[PDB]
Structure formats: C-alpha cells, structure tokens
C-alpha cells in the first residue's frame, strides 16, 4: 500500500556503485583506484558518471552504455537537479 | 541403550556389560517406566570454529544393525535423503559463540508406560522390548559443514548429559531374564 | 531509512525463532526485508474458508456399492442363520470392512495424514438403500471389535443369530429406513493408532442379512442397490514424523 | 580493544547548511515556477511515440503493431517507467495528430474501436463502443480507453492468457500519417519497485 | 428404551444434512446408533496439538545446501558485473529457485495441498550462512517477478550490478549477518495460485556475489557454507477437487 | 558478529503437552495403582538375598558370612542401592523363612543373637538380648537389629576399628536350610550419592 | 416410507463465500470502472446499424 | 418422494471476471477461451442404479432448469469474432 511511484521512495532506493579493492600496497593518501573504474573518486550528485563503450562492426561502431542507480534512472528524465546525496560505505573486511 | 560384550574362554563366555546413568540404574529396578527426558548438548570447541547443527527428534522404533549379541544404529536410513528433517520437531543450533542447548523431549507414545528392558539380552532374534522400551530417537547431524582454519582443531567434541525429570516407575520388579547385578571387573581378561 | 534494500547491520546478540515445527537459534537476529504496508491482493479469502486436516478428514467417502437380487442365494442374500455348529458353516454377509484402515485409505485421506504418528479418532458410517415399494427385505448392520484377532468362538462369525443380533448394530429395512448412520468409537487399547509401526486393524463392520430380498416371483427389477458412505470424527493427529506406512 | 566485526551505524552531514526544503523551495521559486513530487503526473502528460505512423486505407490496426515496439524502446515516460516496475493497472490514452501530406477522398474520417490486447482484427468485431473524427475540421482524435479487465492488475511480461484487458483498433477510410502521442487515465500506475536496467547513450561510427 | 441396538422406525419426513464437505438428502431422518455418554479413552489431545493444513505449510523445508569455496572462479564466486553488453555475458549467480513451486514441491507439502484448486501465499525464506572468522565476503539475495516470462532487457539477469541491487534484497555479510530473512508477498496479478492447470511460477529467487570469498593465501578451509529453509505464509486453500498436478 | 565461545543457557521443549503430572497421576490411576516418589520404602520391603543357606547343627553363625556376598551381588535393594552411596545409618531387620527338608529332632528350634560387625563366634558371648522361634509352629523367624554404634554414620568400605556397630548371630539345634530375606528399620538411609557402576546382563556360553 | 412423488423445495449453495455484492463491487472497482444494471440505458446508447 | 432441488453455485475463479464467448468458434483449434468462459461444472451421477418395477417406465427424465442471480457485466462490447446476429430459420433445408 506503499506509494512506488514518489521521488523519494525511488531515488531512496540504494544501489551499489562502487567495489574497490583495498590491498596491503595501497599507499596512504593515495586513492583506492583497484578492482572497478572511477577508482577512489566519487562524483557527487544524482546524474551518471561511469559508463562503458561496446564497439562492433568496414567500420567499428561504439555506442556508450550506463549502469545506474534509480537516483540517476529518475534524473535522466529531467535537464536540472537539486538534493542531498547520500552515500553508505561499507567494508568487507574481518575482526 | 548401549552395552559393550566381553568375551571370555573350549568355548568363550560372553557377558554384556551396560554404562548406566542414575536414570537408567534406577529404571533398571522396575519393569515399566515414563519421565521427561532431559539431555544437556554441549560442543567442546573454540571461538573460530562454526556451524550449525541440527537436533531432531523422530518418534517410533530406531534403524537397527541386529547383530548376535548387540544392536546399533543403521546410519545409512537417517541420510537427509531417506531421513528428511522437514516434519520433525527440531531445534537448530549456531555454533559462532553458543556451545550449548538443554533439550527436554515430554513422553509421548502409544503406551502409558514404556519398558525398562532396553539392550538388555537385545539382539537380532530379541528386539522387540528394545524397540518397546524407548519413545523415540534424537539425531544430531550437520546443517553446515565444520567451518575451522588451519591454526585450530579439525575436530570438535560433542558431549551429551542425560538425566530426566517428571519421572514415574511402575512395578517394583525388573523386566529382565535374570537379576539387578552389578558388574565387578575382574583383577585380568581372563577372569570370568 | 531506505527502501527495497535490506542493510548488513549488527543486532540482538541471542536470537531464537520457532516456526511452527521448527525451532531456531541465530548468533543475531536476522536482517530481514518484508514487505512494506503489505496487503492481500488476491480473493480466496473471500470463495470459501480454508479447511483444516479434521475438516477434511470428516468428509464422507464413498468406500462400496452393493446390489443385491433376489433369487441369488449368495452369501449377499443368504439370510442369518439360527445356529452355527461348525466353523465350515459361518455366518454369511454382505459385505465387510476393516477399520479404520478402510477409511484412511480412501480419499485421499492418507495424504493428510502422512508425517504424522498417532491418531485418535471415530468412525462414521453411513448407508443409503434403494429399493422400489414393491421390494422388502431387511438387513442388520454391526461392529465387532478386534473379531479377526480374538478366538473364533468369540467372533461375531462362528456365532448365533441370536448373538450377532446381540452386538451393537441397527436395523436396516428397505421400506422404513432407507438410510442409517453409525458410529464406531475409538477402538484400540493403546492410546492412539499408531500409523507408521503398528498396521493393525481394531473394529471389523459387518452387513447381515436377516430377511432374504423379497420381491415378485418374475427379474431384473426385483433388486435393492446400496452405497457405503465414511468419514472420521473426534479427530487428534499430534505428533509429526518422517517415515510412512507404504500401505498409505 | 575487544576483536569483533560490527556495526555502529555512524552517520555524518559535511556541512552547517540550513533547512534543505527552504533551499529548494526558494529555488523553485526563483528558477522552476513548478514542483515535480511523483511520476504518475509524468503519466497523466502526452508524450510522443511516433512521429509518422503510417496506415493503409481501410484496414483495421490494433495499436499494438506500434506500442510493442514504443514500450520497449524508452522514450516515453510510460516506457521509461516500466522498466522500473512489474505490474500496471488503469486505463490509457491516445491523441493521433493527423500529419496527411495528400487528400485522398472528399471525405477523410477516422474511427477507433475497442479490441481485447493482443488480438487481431480478424478476431474481433467493429460493434461496442467508438469514436470517429474528421481530420479537416479536428485533426486531433483523442480517444480513452478503459480498464476493462479480468484481472486487477496486468503484468508487463508474457501470459499465459489472452484477451484478459481491453485495447485500441483504429481505422480510416484513406491513408493517414499521425502524430501518436499516449499516456495514462486518472487511474493508471505501475506496482513494485524493481532495479534499473541499463541505458543508451551516444553512439558512434568509426572508419577504423 | 433398548441398548446396543438400533430398531427400524420413522422419523421426521425431510432430512438434510451435511458434513463438511458434502450434503446428505435423505427422505426421513436416518437411525443412527451412536454410543451412549461416549468418552475419550486416547490420550492424543494430550500429547500435543493438533496441527492445521496451514501449520503444515509454514513448516521450514531444507531446499539447498551450498558449499562456496575460495579461488573457484566459478559462477558461485564469480562476482557481480558492472555492466552487461551482451547476453552472452550475463550476471551469473550462486543458485536460483523458481517460486513458489520450489516450496510446494518440498517438504511434503504437495501431499496437503492435493485435492485443493486455489493458493494465495507469501513465502517466507530463510539462509544461514557459516564461515570461519578468517574467511569474509557479500552476496546479495533478490528477488525479481516474472523474471522468466519477462522480456530479457527488464530480467534481473542482462542488466547491471546497480540495476541488480536495485532489486528487494538484502546484504548477507559473512561476519555481520549469518542469517537473513526474506519475505516474497503474493506475486501473481490473478486472484489465487491455480495448482492444477497452470503451472507456473511468478517469481525467481537469486543469490549473488557482491565481492568473493577472501580468505589467506592458502586452501580446504578458504570457504562458506550455505542452507536455504523455506516455507509459507498467509496461506488460503479454499475450494476442493479431484483433479491433481501430476508435478505435485 | 563478536569472537567468544561462551553459553547462553538455551532450552527448548519439543511439544505443546500437558501438564507432565496430570498425566502421570491418570496414567498411574489406570495402571498402576501407586505411586513410588522415593526409594527409602525399598529398604522398608523385605527382598531374597538367599533362597538356601544351609547350617550346622549347633553352630552360632554370623549373619556376616552371608552378606559379605549378597552385598557385592547386587540383587537385594539394600545392596543394589549401597553401589550409589558411601554411607548408611539405622538398623536392618532379617526373616529366616524354614526350607528345611527333613526332620532332624524331636523339636526344632531357632535363636538369634546380638554380636559386633566382622566379629567370629569366638569372640563374642552369648547373652544379651535374644529372640527365640519353632519352625514348626512358626517357621518365620523374624528380627530386627538395631544402630547400636560408636558412630553416627557407618562407611561401605572397610575401617581400622572393628566391632563399632552390631550385627546378628544365629544359631539352632539341627541343620537348617532357609530362605533369608532382609530389610532396613523405620530408620536406615544412605549418604553421600555418587556415581553408578556398571551392570552385568545375559550371559552367553558360545562354542567357537 | 410413504409412497408419494412430491417437492421439499429444497436449495443448496456450494460455498462459504462472502456476499455477492461486495466481491462484485469490488471487482467492478478494480476492472470495470462502471456497473449496468439495465438494458434501457443501452437504449440510450448510439450503436451502427449500417456503415455505409 | 422428492423429485427436486434448486442449486445456487457462487462465483470462485482465480479472475474477477469470465469471458463471455463460451463456445462461439470453440473447437480443436480454438479452445482456449471457452475453458476460460466457465467456472467449472456439475456432473449427475447416479450413486444408487434407478429402481422401479415393470409396471412403471425403466427410466425418467432429468430436466434442468437455468438462470442467474448476482449479476454483474463489464464490458459492453462482444469477444466475438463476428457481431451480434439471430439465427432466422430458413424455409427450407436448402437455403443458406
């Protein structure tokens, strides 16, 4: 009986971005740039950053493909934006 | 339920001898009984060792290997294939942090009164007061492997107490071909 | 805070769930994603109510179907006799039923009753007769408890009219009671069936005939036809099991 | 220090900013004019699918032949939503804006009839309910459809069942090229929310 | 007046009546010998309750047993993809299990649904995950409806890591949360599950692999072990047949 | 989770049973008619540790030289019950049932005495209290010894002081065989309860 | 028994079902969006006779 | 003695409407939408053999009377393939 269709029960439903690889090497104030692109940086704001190109083909034709969270499904739709980003990061990690 | 044979010589003597409880020594003085059965299940372990154990309980008779002087348990029937736990009265148990769970099991049976016969004289041609002097059977089988590195034991050690409560006895007199007698191990093996 | 995602979270250190068989213990309580300000969206709520094991277990099943003829002198119209001197010359019926395995199985009863161990339970019988008003004839319908185990000189067989009249039974005429119901109670010494061990029967019903069929002295209407109708009452399956009797 | 994996549930804001609802209603007043809060208004709009749908002279066309493909490309909002979701329910609408480059007969009308979803026109009859217009004098027909349905809800995958929902035929005396622009009734919405899919961006051809 | 025997005899000229199932017209009253101050002699109600078709159903069921082993690179620790160009190159998962015939096919629970037509059910599931304190790893456990019946581009599978997460779903970490509950509501858009014409499933259950097992450079005991349970919830069986799915 | 291996006293019954003595005390009133809640009335019945033991004629025999072994054999309660326990108190009460086959004398006549424990009929006199039967009017003769001691408890293992408790000495005129049935006063008991040993069941000879 | 071929009027319905009119208005409300209740306003409907 | 009994069978389907096309175009090919007109259906089955003498017909007639009660129509559009039409007998046999 819940409303799906609200911008904020949309754009608050989470969706992993981000799975870095923090190894014993990893240098201190050095971004943790291993295990997925956009490596330590996180662009702050409900629009796409990462995306991928397929090229196939004489010629090689490249279209550009995005992998995103409802936030950016929903912003997609619109030419401006405004909100708080949030953002939960969690460490796979043991004792 | 369990009784281990000595074999003595020609001929060779053999003479079953029983490692009773308080309970079963004094069940052992009376032909019927009924009581709440108590059993205390502990793992001896670390805190790196885990899993998940299942404790069930079946009502009836118990898979039997009949041997000429024993009975035990057929482990081939109690396989979660031909023994599903799924409509069984259980009680699963994480080993992450606990060790232990006190499991009482109320009687239930047919009977008002069980026997008090248990392994005594049981074997493949004397089974049935066996079968009739138990309400049922725990099995204790893994729901997830033993999870251990490489820097504890392999191996755990599960340790199980008995006693009961609730308990009533019947007759005054024992079920059993012969008389209460207790076991005086002999100075040798050659003893009889 | 968010929605359609359950978060890896810490929580209560000691955690123990019972589902209705089925007793848990977790190291914390479980992170759990239901769902939210969940409604029923279906009608079946609303077609019928959900019947239980008892209910149906109490649902009539139709176990025979006689049809007597007159004339036949078959042990279905051999009427009662006075004596019995010899175990060569029983009393002749109609038909027989061992109970209560005659009930559980039959429709699809043993289905429901599969995993579980001990059953207390009644049995109803029901017959319903038909025979057209210019047919008469009247049968006796009884129950005689543990009559394939107790000696034959105790069996409602191998005994007198007299005596077979003398057990629980009812008087089934053709033109004053075309139906009768019976109820057989619970019949074993023990404390309940056990339906996994012990596959025995306690109670054996039997139709007799006390009148042979009397119609015209022509044929093939001259007849009465019969149907059996069973179920159980006072109903208690507790224990639950995974073994089965192969007999269902 | 006591070893364990855990979680404290820490929570942290970066900034002494005030109130983010004044913020932003204070922007929309100064740079919006409006305030978009749910996505069904996006349903209640007409948006394009097909800018040239061209149709044969007295034929009868289910609209399906054109929202099959309008629904799994994503450039309305009733596509681009449903990727979000399972189910649908309500009733929909559609406005064919008459774009004929020639006349064709002194008489140019257009007719639309309902129709169970998924059907053909040789499997159902032109009675019931209709709506004609005559692209000269209205070249827009706008037409409702309701939710004449045997179920509740619809879902958006393949069933087992057919002709369980109502639908649109439409019909013309002439060939006519139309606009199409769709979206929902009062009543239709979309049910769970589900995961994204992945979007198309740019594309490309290189002479490599 | 007379004991243990029932004796011909009218009765009231329209009879009706009906036991819970079916409805018995008789044209008068039936004579019923039934037992005079009858007593329960079992001692079943005292042993435990007796248990609904219902309870039944909300019995947990051992569906799966997974064994993840580090180093596998195998489709069980293969972890979820970012993107997915091609349908060649799905997301690959650890199991998946077709609802909620997985459940009705379990567990004994086809035997107490036969006989009936119509099912409205949540279902409720239930992991319990062990690994070693040493060992550590995510997956994430969703569910999509219609997943197989859906068109590939809208399937859970052939979309992306943010799209799968996405889903309702919960993050099952091998050292926060050993166990995670789930609950799957009523999924089909029709009024009630039909368990004899349409076989069919309206939701696929997943489980993936956020981030693979890590554990030390080692061996055997680099690994994670999983168990699924299963069973019902907000159940309705209402009206009965005597047809069955022979996939039961 | 947190590192511990600890116990968090967890206990589950397995069935919604009544309560256990309701239906106890049925089962009891329909097959068994009483009820045994302690096992101090065991020592207060009288139990066979002999069905034949023979004497001599004219000898005064302590009752030791019998239950020396029927206290190791464990068929009586009294010694069944001692494998339990360290300590006991209180006297005992013996019954000498005449099994005697023959006629050796125109009259037969049986007397008990008093004498210390582990004492020889040469170290001891024959007065003080004594009870006298004719098997032949009476053949049950029936004593009781009382708690005569030095001590308040006595051990069941063996002491450096002797003759710290009283015993029985019996004697009669001919050769008597008896069945001995013995038994506590309204006052024996145990001690301390210890562990079990283990019990002896059918013997078999086989020739291998 | 008495011989007689007569009517008990005697009815029988198969289910524990709710009332007709709610389950029907709820359907109406959730699939159909209207109710007929007569076949004058179908009357009052224009319907083709001839196309052309 | 009774020869009669009025059976009232509620709505129960795992949809909230049915289809009203029954067996209009129903055959091998096209099946579908009739099992999906119908809720169910009755059987009569004899659970005694019919009983009567030689001076009376060995067998009766079953009349089944119809009509509903409850009613509810959603669409006011057929599902058939063709319109509306009645059935005019023709005067012959011959005739189309």
Request: glycine share 4%; charged share 20%; with cysteine.
């Amino acid at each position: 009986a819940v409303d799906e269709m609200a911008i904020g029960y949309v754009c608050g439903n989470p969706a992993i971005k981000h799975v870095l690889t923090w190894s014993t090497t990893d240098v201190v104030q050095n971004p943790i740039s291993n295990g997925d692109d956009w490596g330590g940086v996180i662009p702050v704001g409900m629009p796409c950053y990462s995306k991928t190109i397929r090229a196939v083909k004489a010629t090689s034709t490249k279209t550009e493909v995005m992998d995103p969270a409802p936030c950016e499904y929903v912003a997609n739709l619109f030419s401006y934006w405004r909100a708080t980003m949030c953002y939960r990061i969690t460490v796979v990690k043991t004792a | 339920y369990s009784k281990t044979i000595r074999a003595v010589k020609a001929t060779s003597t053999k003479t079953e001898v029983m490692d009773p409880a308080p309970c079963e020594y004094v069940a052992n003085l009376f032909s019927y009984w009924r009581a709440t059965m108590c059993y205390r299940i502990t793992v001896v372990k670390t805190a790196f060792h885990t899993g998940r154990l299942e404790i069930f309980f079946e009502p009836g008779s118990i898979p039997t290997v009949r041997t000429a002087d024993n009975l035990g348990p057929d482990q081939t029937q109690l396989n979660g294939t031909i023994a599903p736990s799924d409509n069984n009265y259980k009680y699963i148990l994480d080993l992450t942090n606990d060790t232990e769970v006190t499991i009482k099991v109320p009687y239930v049976s047919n009977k008002m009164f069980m026997k008090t016969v248990g392994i005594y004289g049981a074997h493949d041609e004397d089974n049935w007061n066996f079968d009739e002097s138990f309400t049922g059977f725990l099995c204790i089988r893994p729901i997830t492997k033993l999870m251990a590195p490489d820097t504890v034991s392999q191996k755990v050690s599960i340790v199980v107490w008995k006693w009961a409560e609730d308990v009533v006895v019947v007759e005054p007199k024992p079920l059993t071909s012969g008389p209460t007698q207790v076991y005086n191990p002999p100075a040798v093996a050659r003893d009889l | 805070n968010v929605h359609n995602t359950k978060l890896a979270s810490t929580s209560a250190e000691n955690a123990i769930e019972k589902e209705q068989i089925t007793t848990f213990h977790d190291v914390e309580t479980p992170n759990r994603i239901d769902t939210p300000m969940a409604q029923d969206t279906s009608s079946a709520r609303s077609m019928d109510d959900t019947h239980s094991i008892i209910q149906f277990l109490q649902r009539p099943v139709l176990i025979d179907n006689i049809e007597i003829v007159a004339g036949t002198t078959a042990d279905n119209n051999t009427a009662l006799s006075r004596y019995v001197l010899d175990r060569t010359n029983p009393q002749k019926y109609i038909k027989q039923w061992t109970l209560p395995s005659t009930v559980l199985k039959a429709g699809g009863k043993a289905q429901k009753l599969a995993n579980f161990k001990y059953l207390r339970c009644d049995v109803q019988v029901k017959l319903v007769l038909n025979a057209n008003p210019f047919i008469a004839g009247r049968l006796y319908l009884a129950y005689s408890p543990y009559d394939d185990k107790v000696a034959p000189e105790r069996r409602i067989i191998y005994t007198s009219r007299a005596g077979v009249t003398g057990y629980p039974g009812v008087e089934l005429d053709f033109q004053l009671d075309n139906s009768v119901e019976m109820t057989i109670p619970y019949a074993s010494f023990q404390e309940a069936y056990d339906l996994v061990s012990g596959n025995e029967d306690f109670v054996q019903l039997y139709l007799f005939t006390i009148a042979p069929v009397l119609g015209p002295s022509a044929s093939a209407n001259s007849k009465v036809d019969l149907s059996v109708y069973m179920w159980l009452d006072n109903i208690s399956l507790v224990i639950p099991t995974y073994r089965l009797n192969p007999n269902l | 220090i006591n070893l364990s994996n855990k979680t404290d549930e820490n929570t942290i804001s970066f900034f002494d900013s005030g109130d983010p609802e004044r913020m932003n209603s204070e922007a929309l007043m100064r740079g919006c004019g409006e305030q978009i809060v749910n996505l069904r208004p996006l349903l209640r709009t007409f948006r394009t699918i097909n800018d040239n749908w061209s149709l044969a002279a007295n034929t009868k066309t289910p609209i399906t032949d054109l929202t099959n493909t309008a629904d799994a490309e994503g450039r309305d909002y009733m596509s681009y939503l449903s990727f979000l979701y399972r189910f649908y329910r309500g009733g929909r609408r559609y406005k064919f804006f008459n774009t004929t480059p020639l006349k064709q007969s002194q008489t140019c009308y257009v007719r639309s009839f309902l129709i169970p979803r998924n059907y053909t026109a040789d499997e159902i009859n032109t009675d019931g309910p209709s709506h004609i217009t005559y692209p000269v004098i209205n070249p827009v027909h706008e037409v409702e459809v309701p939710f004449y349905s045997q179920y509740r809800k619809i879902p958006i995958a393949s069933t087992t069942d057919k002709g369980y929902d109502s639908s649109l035929m439409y019909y013309t005396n002439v060939g006519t090229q139309q606009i199409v622009a769709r979206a929902g009734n009062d009543d239709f919405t979309f049910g769970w929310m589900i995961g994204t899919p992945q979007l198309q961006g740019i594309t490309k051809e290189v002479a490599n």
